Amino acid sequence: TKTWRKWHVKVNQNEKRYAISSAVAASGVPSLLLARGHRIEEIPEVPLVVDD
Amino acid sequence: GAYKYLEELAKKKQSDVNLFLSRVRAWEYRQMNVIHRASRPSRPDKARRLGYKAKQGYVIYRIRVRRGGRKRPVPKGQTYGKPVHQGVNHLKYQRSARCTAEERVGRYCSNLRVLNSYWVNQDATYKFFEVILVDPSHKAIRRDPRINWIVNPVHKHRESRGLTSIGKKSRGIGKGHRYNNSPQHATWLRHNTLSLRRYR
Amino acid sequence: KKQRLVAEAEAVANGKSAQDVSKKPYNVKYGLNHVVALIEAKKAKLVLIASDVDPIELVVFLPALCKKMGVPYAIVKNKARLGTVIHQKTAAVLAVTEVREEDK
Amino acid sequence: AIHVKGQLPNAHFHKDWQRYVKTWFNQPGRKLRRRQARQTKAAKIAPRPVEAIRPAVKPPTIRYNMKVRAGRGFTLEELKAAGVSRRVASTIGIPVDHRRRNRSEESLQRNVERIKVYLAHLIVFPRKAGQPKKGDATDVSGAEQTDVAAVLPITQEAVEEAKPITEEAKNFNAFSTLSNERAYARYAGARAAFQKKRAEEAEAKKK
Amino acid sequence: APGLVVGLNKGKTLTKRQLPERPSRRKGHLSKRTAFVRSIVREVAGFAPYERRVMELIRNSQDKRARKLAKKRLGTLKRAKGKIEELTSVIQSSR
RNA sequence: GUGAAGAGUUUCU
RNA sequence: UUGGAUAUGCCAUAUAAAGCGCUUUCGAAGAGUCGAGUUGUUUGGGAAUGCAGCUCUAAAUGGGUGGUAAAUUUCAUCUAA
RNA sequence: UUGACCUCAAAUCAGGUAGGACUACGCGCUGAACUUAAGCAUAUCAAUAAGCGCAGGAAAAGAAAAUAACCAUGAUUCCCUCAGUAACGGCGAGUGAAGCGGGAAAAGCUCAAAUUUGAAAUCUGGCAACAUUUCUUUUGUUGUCCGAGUUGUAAUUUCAA
Ligand SMILES: [Mg+2]
Ligand SMILES: [Mg+2]
Ligand SMILES: [Mg+2]
Ligand SMILES: [Mg+2]
Ligand SMILES: [Mg+2]
Ligand SMILES: [Mg+2]
Ligand SMILES: [Mg+2]
Ligand SMILES: [Mg+2]
Ligand SMILES: [Mg+2]
Ligand SMILES: [Mg+2]
Ligand SMILES: [Mg+2]
């Protein structure tokens, strides 16, 4: 094994931003939160926003 | 003053005066040791312009160096390789004979620092040089801001690393397109190092 | 020189400058570069060139330079004898620029 | 052996290249080191600007002479015309380039204006605190480390948005002018050598 | 100076101005003191043997032979022509 | 390097 | 630990050294080195890129560079040893 | 006869200094062949391995005898780019830089060549005193004398002048 194996992977900036946008949009969907294992059965609202 | 006259007269190496003086001095030099101390510069104007000063701590040494090429020192002309490397006779050392003069005087005066050197004479067998040396332990040198730099340990045996005037010439140190091979090994390293970035 | 300087110092406190208490010096000029300049400027009345300057090129041009400038010159024995005049071990050359009226 | 589609291979890997492989695993470390050095330097020279003011110069060659960029230092003529001695220039952060010269008034005036703007925004502290002298300032209280690029940016050259089309422009023949001008330069030497033969070999006619 | 990129006086037209004197470009000028020193040195030192040979060919009106010898001795023709002119002035200086 | 003869301003024995 | 502050409170550094400013006449500038040939080596450097040996050996607006050898004439740029 | 000067010696003379080691990185010298060319000699491997000299915390390089050919640039180094390009090459196998542009960092200078000549203005050493300290371990100051130095130590200048 050599150190100059490729360790890091480049993603296009726009695809990275697409991915984060999708991830934030998914956080607004109660079914996806429950599917991903979050115990959110009792929270009042999704998205959940608290005071400053 | 006299220095301008000495500079102009030193350019006339074919004149009757300089031819005669060269003959007698070359004979005198051949009578003493290969390396010997000079009481004073034989060329005071040349010595000053190369950094010499007439104060304690500056030393002049004279040395003669055999002229001609470098015969390959292999046993019976036998090189054990390809024909491109079978040459023995018409080969040349990459360092000047002046550089060798500095090297040998520097070993002879291992407490001193080689400052510079200049040609003084030649016959068919030898070239004669005078090597200017400085004592880094002498107080007159250590308190002098114009020569102080040479006390610092980075200047140890600068002649052995090609750092004198003739050493940098033999290394091909220069500016611009004619010296692209530059410091050779460092330049070679820059061109033969594969640069593998974190592409992320 | 030390005696002259204490005189100039004493006279520089209540009187005028060092010029008021010291006179113009009359002495032989020495130093090869200095004497060469004097010859080129036609201020040397007489130039005495030592006969045994070991790297001879230091003075080999001096008779031609003196002849060209019309300054009298002589080649004399013993750089060592010339040096004794000026309180040094040796002197390659000496020059007379000015001499007092009694020695003209 | 070669039998596949594509470019004939060219790979320069016949030396011991693995001996001199340079990796970049220290790239974020170097970036952090360099930023920390800048922060250390800024706090040390404060309130002086971290960057010295630089002249604006035109890059050489036809590929870049339409642009403007920072140069090394101000010329001796530029410093002279802005009333700054060359020995004083360095003491107040104005670099001196003894090599560059002003071949045109435009380069000179542009950089003289940069120096004048620098001097007008410059607060020189007195050498002895509380004893202001000539060329110094008496309101040093509001002194802070500021960017020179915030005050004196390098500005690219602007344009004429629109202008009338004159009858001279309408009669101009751009392509023919380019062809003629190239031909005139091309055969200047033959014309000059011809002129010698036109007026010299005729001299024998006199006698 | 048409302001084009082709032709004799091509290029953008700006306000031309006089560049200041660069003292480094004074090199090669003959100072009066240096000329005096060289005349003295030429008196003390003589002429090099090839210089005497070239002057002899000049004195015998062998102008091509002098040029061939001076170029052969000094390398280039440009240095030869300068040397032959200098030695010609010497010859006429003695006349 | 320094000197002497000889050869149809020179360098050869 | 005068690095910064009123760096106070005070040492007493501080009497003669720099800045621009008109006019002149000036303005020394590195040699067995540069350069030339040739041999070897080296370079991507091609009628020689650098280095080195040997032969020849400079100049004073001279000299170097301007990537095709040469002669001449210009121009630009630099200012070696 | 002595003395001066020059040149050259000697001393367990007074005081210093060099060598050896570490070699990852650095500056040089010297220097292969295996190998690739489907053989092989030029070429390549490689201005590499081995051999030798010499340094530092970095080294080397460095304030243009540099670029360019522009509206010009402006010490050095390093990165990206130029570019697997111009070019070299049994023009085969193979090899292969540079100017511009962007960026990191930026900093500039010292001599030799000058008559101080109404003043060698310069320097080392010894001795003494007085200070000083990472330190009784360090580092200087003054006086005096002797040496060095005019075959030139200082001072104004270094071409940008
Ligand atoms: Mg250096
Ligand atoms: Mg120079
Ligand atoms: Mg070799
Ligand atoms: Mg094979
Ligand atoms: Mg095979
Ligand atoms: Mg085989
Ligand atoms: Mg090795
Ligand atoms: Mg160490
Ligand atoms: Mg260094
Ligand atoms: Mg310079
Ligand atoms: Mg190669």
PDB file of N, CA and C (backbone and C1' of nucleotides) in Angstrom, chain H residues 68-97:
ATOM      1  P     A H  68      11.516  36.730 -23.164  1.00  0.00           P
ATOM      2  O5'   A H  68      10.051  37.299 -23.343  1.00  0.00           O
ATOM      3  C5'   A H  68       9.705  38.105 -24.438  1.00  0.00           C
ATOM      4  C4'   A H  68       9.251  39.455 -23.982  1.00  0.00           C
ATOM      5  C3'   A H  68       8.829  40.388 -25.106  1.00  0.00           C
ATOM      6  O3'   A H  68       7.437  40.272 -25.334  1.00  0.00           O
ATOM      7  C1'   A H  68      10.416  41.466 -23.699  1.00  0.00           C
ATOM      8  P     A H  69       6.830  39.786 -26.732  1.00  0.00           P
ATOM      9  O5'   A H  69       6.636  41.136 -27.542  1.00  0.00           O
ATOM     10  C5'   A H  69       6.363  42.359 -26.879  1.00  0.00           C
ATOM     11  C4'   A H  69       6.965  43.527 -27.610  1.00  0.00           C
ATOM     12  C3'   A H  69       6.807  43.503 -29.135  1.00  0.00           C
ATOM     13  O3'   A H  69       6.530  44.810 -29.609  1.00  0.00           O
ATOM     14  C1'   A H  69       9.095  43.676 -28.559  1.00  0.00           C
ATOM     15  P     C H  70       5.032  45.238 -29.969  1.00  0.00           P
ATOM     16  O5'   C H  70       4.355  45.461 -28.548  1.00  0.00           O
ATOM     17  C5'   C H  70       3.185  44.763 -28.158  1.00  0.00           C
ATOM     18  C4'   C H  70       2.706  45.255 -26.824  1.00  0.00           C
ATOM     19  C3'   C H  70       2.823  46.760 -26.641  1.00  0.00           C
ATOM     20  O3'   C H  70       1.634  47.395 -27.064  1.00  0.00           O
ATOM     21  C1'   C H  70       3.920  45.646 -24.855  1.00  0.00           C
ATOM     22  P     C H  71       1.595  48.931 -27.507  1.00  0.00           P
ATOM     23  O5'   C H  71       1.717  49.709 -26.129  1.00  0.00           O
ATOM     24  C5'   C H  71       2.010  51.097 -26.058  1.00  0.00           C
ATOM     25  C4'   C H  71       1.682  51.656 -24.696  1.00  0.00           C
ATOM     26  C3'   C H  71       2.233  50.862 -23.506  1.00  0.00           C
ATOM     27  O3'   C H  71       2.499  51.757 -22.431  1.00  0.00           O
ATOM     28  C1'   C H  71      -0.117  50.940 -23.381  1.00  0.00           C
ATOM     29  P     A H  72       3.890  52.535 -22.312  1.00  0.00           P
ATOM     30  O5'   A H  72       4.969  51.374 -22.244  1.00  0.00           O
ATOM     31  C5'   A H  72       5.319  50.781 -21.010  1.00  0.00           C
ATOM     32  C4'   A H  72       4.720  49.412 -20.834  1.00  0.00           C
ATOM     33  C3'   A H  72       5.352  48.618 -19.702  1.00  0.00           C
ATOM     34  O3'   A H  72       4.742  48.894 -18.457  1.00  0.00           O
ATOM     35  C1'   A H  72       5.450  47.344 -21.667  1.00  0.00           C
ATOM     36  P     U H  73       5.624  49.220 -17.166  1.00  0.00           P
ATOM     37  O5'   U H  73       6.008  47.786 -16.602  1.00  0.00           O
ATOM     38  C5'   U H  73       5.023  46.788 -16.412  1.00  0.00           C
ATOM     39  C4'   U H  73       5.646  45.426 -16.269  1.00  0.00           C
ATOM     40  C3'   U H  73       6.579  45.250 -15.083  1.00  0.00           C
ATOM     41  O3'   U H  73       5.843  44.854 -13.939  1.00  0.00           O
ATOM     42  C1'   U H  73       7.578  44.385 -17.057  1.00  0.00           C
ATOM     43  P     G H  74       6.350  45.137 -12.447  1.00  0.00           P
ATOM     44  O5'   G H  74       7.823  44.575 -12.417  1.00  0.00           O
ATOM     45  C5'   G H  74       8.142  43.215 -12.151  1.00  0.00           C
ATOM     46  C4'   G H  74       9.635  43.070 -12.076  1.00  0.00           C
ATOM     47  C3'   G H  74      10.278  43.772 -10.882  1.00  0.00           C
ATOM     48  O3'   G H  74      11.508  43.128 -10.596  1.00  0.00           O
ATOM     49  C1'   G H  74      11.031  44.779 -12.864  1.00  0.00           C
ATOM     50  P     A H  75      11.577  41.805  -9.708  1.00  0.00           P
ATOM     51  O5'   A H  75      13.026  41.891  -9.080  1.00  0.00           O
ATOM     52  C5'   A H  75      14.173  41.974  -9.904  1.00  0.00           C
ATOM     53  C4'   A H  75      15.321  41.244  -9.279  1.00  0.00           C
ATOM     54  C3'   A H  75      15.062  39.784  -8.958  1.00  0.00           C
ATOM     55  O3'   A H  75      15.207  38.926 -10.081  1.00  0.00           O
ATOM     56  C1'   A H  75      16.004  40.838  -7.069  1.00  0.00           C
ATOM     57  P     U H  76      14.319  37.598 -10.249  1.00  0.00           P
ATOM     58  O5'   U H  76      14.770  36.648  -9.061  1.00  0.00           O
ATOM     59  C5'   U H  76      16.120  36.266  -8.884  1.00  0.00           C
ATOM     60  C4'   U H  76      16.302  35.567  -7.571  1.00  0.00           C
ATOM     61  C3'   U H  76      15.414  34.366  -7.353  1.00  0.00           C
ATOM     62  O3'   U H  76      15.852  33.222  -8.065  1.00  0.00           O
ATOM     63  C1'   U H  76      15.426  35.703  -5.405  1.00  0.00           C
ATOM     64  P     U H  77      14.798  32.148  -8.622  1.00  0.00           P
ATOM     65  O5'   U H  77      14.195  31.501  -7.311  1.00  0.00           O
ATOM     66  C5'   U H  77      14.996  30.744  -6.421  1.00  0.00           C
ATOM     67  C4'   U H  77      14.221  30.385  -5.190  1.00  0.00           C
ATOM     68  C3'   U H  77      12.947  29.600  -5.446  1.00  0.00           C
ATOM     69  O3'   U H  77      13.208  28.224  -5.608  1.00  0.00           O
ATOM     70  C1'   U H  77      12.484  31.391  -3.981  1.00  0.00           C
ATOM     71  P     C H  78      12.475  27.363  -6.742  1.00  0.00           P
ATOM     72  O5'   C H  78      11.047  27.082  -6.124  1.00  0.00           O
ATOM     73  C5'   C H  78      10.925  26.474  -4.852  1.00  0.00           C
ATOM     74  C4'   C H  78       9.519  26.561  -4.340  1.00  0.00           C
ATOM     75  C3'   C H  78       8.409  26.327  -5.354  1.00  0.00           C
ATOM     76  O3'   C H  78       8.192  24.956  -5.630  1.00  0.00           O
ATOM     77  C1'   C H  78       7.905  28.230  -4.064  1.00  0.00           C
ATOM     78  P     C H  79       7.551  24.456  -7.018  1.00  0.00           P
ATOM     79  O5'   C H  79       5.993  24.665  -6.835  1.00  0.00           O
ATOM     80  C5'   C H  79       5.283  24.139  -5.731  1.00  0.00           C
ATOM     81  C4'   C H  79       3.898  24.726  -5.648  1.00  0.00           C
ATOM     82  C3'   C H  79       3.093  24.706  -6.941  1.00  0.00           C
ATOM     83  O3'   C H  79       2.460  23.467  -7.156  1.00  0.00           O
ATOM     84  C1'   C H  79       2.961  26.850  -5.963  1.00  0.00           C
ATOM     85  P     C H  80       2.377  22.828  -8.620  1.00  0.00           P
ATOM     86  O5'   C H  80       1.210  23.619  -9.348  1.00  0.00           O
ATOM     87  C5'   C H  80      -0.116  23.586  -8.856  1.00  0.00           C
ATOM     88  C4'   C H  80      -0.985  24.582  -9.569  1.00  0.00           C
ATOM     89  C3'   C H  80      -0.898  24.579 -11.082  1.00  0.00           C
ATOM     90  O3'   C H  80      -1.621  23.525 -11.685  1.00  0.00           O
ATOM     91  C1'   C H  80      -0.827  26.798 -10.291  1.00  0.00           C
ATOM     92  P     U H  81      -1.156  22.909 -13.089  1.00  0.00           P
ATOM     93  O5'   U H  81      -1.178  24.140 -14.095  1.00  0.00           O
ATOM     94  C5'   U H  81      -2.396  24.733 -14.521  1.00  0.00           C
ATOM     95  C4'   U H  81      -2.165  26.004 -15.301  1.00  0.00           C
ATOM     96  C3'   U H  81      -1.331  25.870 -16.564  1.00  0.00           C
ATOM     97  O3'   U H  81      -2.044  25.364 -17.672  1.00  0.00           O
ATOM     98  C1'   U H  81      -0.568  27.722 -15.324  1.00  0.00           C
ATOM     99  P     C H  82      -1.340  24.383 -18.720  1.00  0.00           P
ATOM    100  O5'   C H  82      -0.395  25.333 -19.583  1.00  0.00           O
ATOM    101  C5'   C H  82      -0.866  26.538 -20.170  1.00  0.00           C
ATOM    102  C4'   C H  82       0.272  27.469 -20.508  1.00  0.00           C
ATOM    103  C3'   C H  82       1.326  26.891 -21.438  1.00  0.00           C
ATOM    104  O3'   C H  82       0.943  27.005 -22.789  1.00  0.00           O
ATOM    105  C1'   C H  82       2.381  27.911 -19.584  1.00  0.00           C
ATOM    106  P     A H  83       1.271  25.843 -23.828  1.00  0.00           P
ATOM    107  O5'   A H  83       0.750  24.516 -23.114  1.00  0.00           O
ATOM    108  C5'   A H  83       0.787  23.252 -23.766  1.00  0.00           C
ATOM    109  C4'   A H  83       1.186  22.138 -22.831  1.00  0.00           C
ATOM    110  C3'   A H  83       0.550  22.181 -21.441  1.00  0.00           C
ATOM    111  O3'   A H  83       0.396  20.871 -20.924  1.00  0.00           O
ATOM    112  C1'   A H  83       2.900  22.267 -21.250  1.00  0.00           C
ATOM    113  P     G H  84      -0.742  19.844 -21.382  1.00  0.00           P
ATOM    114  O5'   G H  84       0.084  18.490 -21.330  1.00  0.00           O
ATOM    115  C5'   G H  84       0.450  17.779 -22.485  1.00  0.00           C
ATOM    116  C4'   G H  84       1.860  18.044 -22.950  1.00  0.00           C
ATOM    117  C3'   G H  84       2.216  17.221 -24.171  1.00  0.00           C
ATOM    118  O3'   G H  84       3.128  17.966 -24.967  1.00  0.00           O
ATOM    119  C1'   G H  84       3.722  16.693 -22.469  1.00  0.00           C
ATOM    120  P     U H  85       3.241  17.664 -26.527  1.00  0.00           P
ATOM    121  O5'   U H  85       3.341  19.098 -27.190  1.00  0.00           O
ATOM    122  C5'   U H  85       2.238  19.981 -27.217  1.00  0.00           C
ATOM    123  C4'   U H  85       2.705  21.399 -27.048  1.00  0.00           C
ATOM    124  C3'   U H  85       4.026  21.745 -27.735  1.00  0.00           C
ATOM    125  O3'   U H  85       3.841  22.091 -29.095  1.00  0.00           O
ATOM    126  C1'   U H  85       4.022  22.552 -25.501  1.00  0.00           C
ATOM    127  P     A H  86       4.904  21.699 -30.227  1.00  0.00           P
ATOM    128  O5'   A H  86       6.078  22.754 -30.055  1.00  0.00           O
ATOM    129  C5'   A H  86       5.970  24.061 -30.586  1.00  0.00           C
ATOM    130  C4'   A H  86       7.194  24.871 -30.268  1.00  0.00           C
ATOM    131  C3'   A H  86       8.527  24.254 -30.647  1.00  0.00           C
ATOM    132  O3'   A H  86       8.838  24.376 -32.017  1.00  0.00           O
ATOM    133  C1'   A H  86       8.665  25.081 -28.461  1.00  0.00           C
ATOM    134  P     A H  87       9.343  23.120 -32.871  1.00  0.00           P
ATOM    135  O5'   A H  87      10.732  22.683 -32.219  1.00  0.00           O
ATOM    136  C5'   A H  87      11.808  23.590 -32.031  1.00  0.00           C
ATOM    137  C4'   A H  87      12.760  23.104 -30.965  1.00  0.00           C
ATOM    138  C3'   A H  87      13.385  21.731 -31.168  1.00  0.00           C
ATOM    139  O3'   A H  87      14.499  21.772 -32.038  1.00  0.00           O
ATOM    140  C1'   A H  87      12.534  21.885 -28.973  1.00  0.00           C
ATOM    141  P     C H  88      14.956  20.505 -32.912  1.00  0.00           P
ATOM    142  O5'   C H  88      15.626  19.506 -31.874  1.00  0.00           O
ATOM    143  C5'   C H  88      16.722  19.881 -31.060  1.00  0.00           C
ATOM    144  C4'   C H  88      17.052  18.789 -30.069  1.00  0.00           C
ATOM    145  C3'   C H  88      17.269  17.408 -30.665  1.00  0.00           C
ATOM    146  O3'   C H  88      18.572  17.227 -31.179  1.00  0.00           O
ATOM    147  C1'   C H  88      15.824  17.251 -28.798  1.00  0.00           C
ATOM    148  P     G H  89      18.839  16.352 -32.493  1.00  0.00           P
ATOM    149  O5'   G H  89      18.224  14.924 -32.165  1.00  0.00           O
ATOM    150  C5'   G H  89      18.740  14.098 -31.137  1.00  0.00           C
ATOM    151  C4'   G H  89      17.912  12.846 -30.969  1.00  0.00           C
ATOM    152  C3'   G H  89      17.584  12.086 -32.230  1.00  0.00           C
ATOM    153  O3'   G H  89      18.678  11.348 -32.667  1.00  0.00           O
ATOM    154  C1'   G H  89      15.703  12.128 -30.785  1.00  0.00           C
ATOM    155  P     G H  90      19.023  11.260 -34.212  1.00  0.00           P
ATOM    156  O5'   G H  90      19.513   9.789 -34.357  1.00  0.00           O
ATOM    157  C5'   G H  90      18.688   8.694 -33.998  1.00  0.00           C
ATOM    158  C4'   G H  90      19.042   7.578 -34.923  1.00  0.00           C
ATOM    159  C3'   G H  90      18.008   7.186 -35.945  1.00  0.00           C
ATOM    160  O3'   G H  90      17.895   8.138 -36.986  1.00  0.00           O
ATOM    161  C1'   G H  90      19.107   5.273 -35.092  1.00  0.00           C
ATOM    162  P     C H  91      16.540   8.271 -37.823  1.00  0.00           P
ATOM    163  O5'   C H  91      15.412   8.424 -36.717  1.00  0.00           O
ATOM    164  C5'   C H  91      15.277   9.608 -35.948  1.00  0.00           C
ATOM    165  C4'   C H  91      13.826   9.955 -35.731  1.00  0.00           C
ATOM    166  C3'   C H  91      13.016  10.221 -36.991  1.00  0.00           C
ATOM    167  O3'   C H  91      11.654   9.907 -36.713  1.00  0.00           O
ATOM    168  C1'   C H  91      13.099  12.187 -35.688  1.00  0.00           C
ATOM    169  P     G H  92      10.905   8.699 -37.440  1.00  0.00           P
ATOM    170  O5'   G H  92      11.155   7.443 -36.499  1.00  0.00           O
ATOM    171  C5'   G H  92      11.007   7.479 -35.087  1.00  0.00           C
ATOM    172  C4'   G H  92      11.401   6.148 -34.497  1.00  0.00           C
ATOM    173  C3'   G H  92      11.036   5.902 -33.046  1.00  0.00           C
ATOM    174  O3'   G H  92       9.692   5.493 -32.913  1.00  0.00           O
ATOM    175  C1'   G H  92      13.255   5.184 -33.458  1.00  0.00           C
ATOM    176  P     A H  93       8.812   5.947 -31.661  1.00  0.00           P
ATOM    177  O5'   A H  93       9.415   5.114 -30.446  1.00  0.00           O
ATOM    178  C5'   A H  93       9.338   3.702 -30.383  1.00  0.00           C
ATOM    179  C4'   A H  93      10.181   3.178 -29.249  1.00  0.00           C
ATOM    180  C3'   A H  93       9.964   3.872 -27.911  1.00  0.00           C
ATOM    181  O3'   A H  93       8.856   3.366 -27.191  1.00  0.00           O
ATOM    182  C1'   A H  93      12.269   3.807 -28.387  1.00  0.00           C
ATOM    183  P     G H  94       7.995   4.340 -26.255  1.00  0.00           P
ATOM    184  O5'   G H  94       9.034   4.797 -25.151  1.00  0.00           O
ATOM    185  C5'   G H  94       9.099   6.136 -24.711  1.00  0.00           C
ATOM    186  C4'   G H  94      10.523   6.597 -24.528  1.00  0.00           C
ATOM    187  C3'   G H  94      10.664   7.997 -23.964  1.00  0.00           C
ATOM    188  O3'   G H  94      10.512   8.049 -22.561  1.00  0.00           O
ATOM    189  C1'   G H  94      12.015   7.817 -25.872  1.00  0.00           C
ATOM    190  P     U H  95       9.728   9.276 -21.890  1.00  0.00           P
ATOM    191  O5'   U H  95      10.756  10.485 -21.949  1.00  0.00           O
ATOM    192  C5'   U H  95      12.106  10.333 -21.544  1.00  0.00           C
ATOM    193  C4'   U H  95      12.974  11.435 -22.101  1.00  0.00           C
ATOM    194  C3'   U H  95      12.638  12.846 -21.647  1.00  0.00           C
ATOM    195  O3'   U H  95      13.207  13.162 -20.397  1.00  0.00           O
ATOM    196  C1'   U H  95      12.969  12.804 -23.996  1.00  0.00           C
ATOM    197  P     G H  96      12.487  14.133 -19.343  1.00  0.00           P
ATOM    198  O5'   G H  96      12.235  15.496 -20.125  1.00  0.00           O
ATOM    199  C5'   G H  96      13.310  16.347 -20.487  1.00  0.00           C
ATOM    200  C4'   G H  96      12.849  17.557 -21.263  1.00  0.00           C
ATOM    201  C3'   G H  96      11.671  18.311 -20.681  1.00  0.00           C
ATOM    202  O3'   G H  96      12.072  19.156 -19.640  1.00  0.00           O
ATOM    203  C1'   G H  96      11.365  18.049 -22.998  1.00  0.00           C
ATOM    204  P     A H  97      11.159  19.366 -18.355  1.00  0.00           P
ATOM    205  O5'   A H  97      10.633  20.852 -18.516  1.00  0.00           O
ATOM    206  C5'   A H  97      11.208  21.904 -17.780  1.00  0.00           C
ATOM    207  C4'   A H  97      12.132  22.752 -18.608  1.00  0.00           C
ATOM    208  C3'   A H  97      11.820  24.227 -18.611  1.00  0.00           C
ATOM    209  O3'   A H  97      12.163  24.868 -17.405  1.00  0.00           O
ATOM    210  C1'   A H  97      12.359  23.554 -20.797  1.00  0.00           C
TER     211        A H  97
END
